[PDB]
Amino acid sequence: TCPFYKKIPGTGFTVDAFQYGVVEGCTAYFLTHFHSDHYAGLSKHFTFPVYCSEITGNLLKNKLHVQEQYIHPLPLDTECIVNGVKVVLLDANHCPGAVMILFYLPNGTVILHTGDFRADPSMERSLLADQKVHMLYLDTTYCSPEYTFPSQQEVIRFAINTAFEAVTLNPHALVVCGTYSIGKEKVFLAIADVLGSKVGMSQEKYKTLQCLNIPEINSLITTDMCSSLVHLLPMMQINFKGLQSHLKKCGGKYNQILAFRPTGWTHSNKFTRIADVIPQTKGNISIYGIPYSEHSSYLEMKRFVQWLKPQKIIPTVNVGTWKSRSTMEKYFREWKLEAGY
Ligand SMILES: CC(=O)Nc1ccccc1O
Numbered sequence: 001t002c003p004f005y006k007k008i009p010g011t012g013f014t015v016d017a018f019q020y021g022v023v024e025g026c027t028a029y030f031l032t033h034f035h036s037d038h039y040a041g042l043s044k045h046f047t048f049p050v051y052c053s054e055i056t057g058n059l060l061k062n063k064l065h066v067q068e069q070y071i072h073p074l075p076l077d078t079e080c081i082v083n084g085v086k087v088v089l090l091d092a093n094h095c096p097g098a099v100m101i102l103f104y105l106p107n108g109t110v111i112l113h114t115g116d117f118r119a120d121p122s123m124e125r126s127l128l129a130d131q132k133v134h135m136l137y138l139d140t141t142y143c144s145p146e147y148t149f150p151s152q153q154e155v156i157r158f159a160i161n162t163a164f165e166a167v168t169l170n171p172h173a174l175v176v177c178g179t180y181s182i183g184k185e186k187v188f189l190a191i192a193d194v195l196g197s198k199v200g201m202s203q204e205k206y207k208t209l210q211c212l213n214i215p216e217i218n219s220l221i222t223t224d225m226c227s228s229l230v231h232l233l234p235m236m237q238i239n240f241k242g243l244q245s246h247l248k249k250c251g252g253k254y255n256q257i258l259a260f261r262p263t264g265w266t267h268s269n270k271f272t273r274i275a276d277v278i279p280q281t282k283g284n285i286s287i288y289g290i291p292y293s294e295h296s297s298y299l300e301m302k303r304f305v306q307w308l309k310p311q312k313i314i315p316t317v318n319v320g321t322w323k324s325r326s327t328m329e330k331y332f333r334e335w336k337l338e339a340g341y
């Protein structure tokens with residue numbers, strides 16, 4: 001059965017609710033982004049209207065094989081009427097195609113659903129600037145002050161500089177980057193750009209990237225592994241065994257691997273700085289874990305919410321334990337009381 005925090009009251013709408021069968025009363029199913037925990041249940045035999053971004057629509061059609069008649073793409077930053085209700089989609093600063101949804105209810109209530117997002121000050125000058133928001137459905141992934149990590153720009157600077165140094169010292173080094181979903185494409189794109197190379201990958205991953213409306217994409221990626229000195233592999237293969245195996249397949253072209261595992265937050269963030277990060281090394285293989293986040297830090301989340309000043313907050317992540325629920329509710333009260341409300 002579909003939980004309360006995935007339903008929008010006073011409407012026939014649900015958000016990211018595809019794993020519960022036919023939801024009684026739902027006339028339109030919104031999908032915030034193409035990550036598996038959110039699309040769970042969608043498949044080629046789905047027969048209800050799905051509302052989403054153009055990029056998400058491309059992935060539904062080509063990867064999940066949802067029929068074209070049921071896919072309803074909407075432009076960003078544009079007032080649209082859906083089943084008699086005004087809605088707006090806003091960029092979520094998450095993965096490609098990810099959106100937040102503003103719902104203008106018939107009774108005068110205004111609801112913002114963030115989907116998954118990485119809060120940014122630029123959101124303070126979107127269409128959010130105008131009007132009051134009564135209810136906020138919030139991505140609370142990292143809602144605790146221990147969750148710190150650098151800017152995406154800082155992390156990419158580290159990756160580019162590390163890769164360029166290694167390959168300039170040894171022109172026979174291969175660079176490998178792990179992936180298991182869409183998002184974080186800047187990691188491999190920025191490294192390949194500094195090395196003067198296209199990014200090589202499987203047919204399956206190439207298909208996925210071809211759905212994302214990235215400018216000049218044909219100039220940046222390839223299925224010809226031999227032509228490329230930056231390769232993408234499934235995240236599960238980014239370990240000494242998997243990388244040794246991959247090096248064997250390259251036909252004596254390379255004699256060293258430098259690999260990157262983009263993660264979210266890890267406990268090594270509580271001790272180390274990005275500048276001081278070191279790899280795990282065995283022989284001619286080195287692996288860097290880099291903290292490239294597509295979710296808000298605690299401080300980014302706090303700033304956004306204190307600016308928006310919602311009357312009510314409904315968390316959408318870490319909802320399963322009493323301890324998590326109590327901790328989040330305490331921070332929301334601090335933030336409110338502190339802002340002067
Ligand atoms: C806690 C709540 O419901 N809302 C709120 C309102 C103003 C500032 C911060 C806040 O968190």
Ligand code: NI
Nearest residue numbers: 033035094116
């Ligand atoms: Ni996500």
